[PDB]
Paper text:
Vaccinia virus, the vaccine used to eradicate smallpox, has about 200 genes, and many of these encode proteins that help the virus evade the host's immune defences. This paper concerns the vaccinia virus proteins A52 and B14, which block signalling pathways leading to the activation of the NF-κB transcription factor and thereby diminish the host immune response to infection. The structures of A52 and B14 are entirely α helical, both comprising seven α helices and adopting the Bcl-2–like fold. We show that both proteins are Bcl-2 family members but lack a surface groove for binding BH3 peptides and, consonant with this, are not anti-apoptotic. Instead these proteins have acquired the ability to inhibit signalling pathways that activate NF-κB.
Author numbering:
A (entry chain B), B (entry chain A): 40 to 189
Amino acid sequence: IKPDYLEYDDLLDRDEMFTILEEYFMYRGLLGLRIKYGRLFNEIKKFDNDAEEQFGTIEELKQKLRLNSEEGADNFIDYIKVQKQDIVKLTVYDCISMIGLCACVVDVWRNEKLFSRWKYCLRAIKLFINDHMLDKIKSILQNRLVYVEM
Amino acid sequence: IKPDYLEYDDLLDRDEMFTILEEYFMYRGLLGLRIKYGRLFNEIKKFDNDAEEQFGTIEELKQKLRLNSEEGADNFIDYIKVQKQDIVKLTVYDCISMIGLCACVVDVWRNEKLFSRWKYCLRAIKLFINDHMLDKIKSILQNRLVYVEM
């Protein structure tokens, strides 16, 4: 049995980055941010800052993609595919920003009670972030948590 | 990619009983019951009646097992082991009541904001309900859904 990541403070080598992200989008997407997070989820939360910088404000994105419309989730996936298509040399930081964007998007859906749309965040991550990039994100998070400790 | 089960109205061969129950406990444990459910979850919700008849009221269990205490999840698992011990020969209907019991317990934890405890419902199901029994539960649900169509 894997741990629950909601209040988890570490990122061990045996912890699977994809599972962490699944639990992150589940809890953020269903419960929201008025909940205590552990140090792990609190580090992932910091990715929101990167997202806003790379892709713009969530307000602008909400309007551009009509996120709460019937087509909103499909519009978000299309947007992610456009980014994947267009970024010439994808970096781990593009992927970090994309995780943050998914997180800001899942908030819009939660606030609207479109609870099941959190699943699209996972669909988006699988399209955009390969296993090599997941490993790089994992190592970044491990280093940042060590720095927080020390 | 499997469908989302929150608003799902069917139960097909490809839909796995354990995944359905994972999502049921996740959604009920995190969002609660003031949410639109599909026909599938609405049938599973009927298992609450079986639970109360077989195991007693949630108020009795909450007290007996000190569910919201530090030890509450472990007390719940101990209790599941007790029931399995005391049942002479387990039937599909014992397993149905047990699913309803998990559901009624997850409500108590949601209400207390012990949000990660829903995971213990899955541990309980794995201890109590084998794949043979899950198959039988699936058949029963499928039958009940046909009646709802008619």
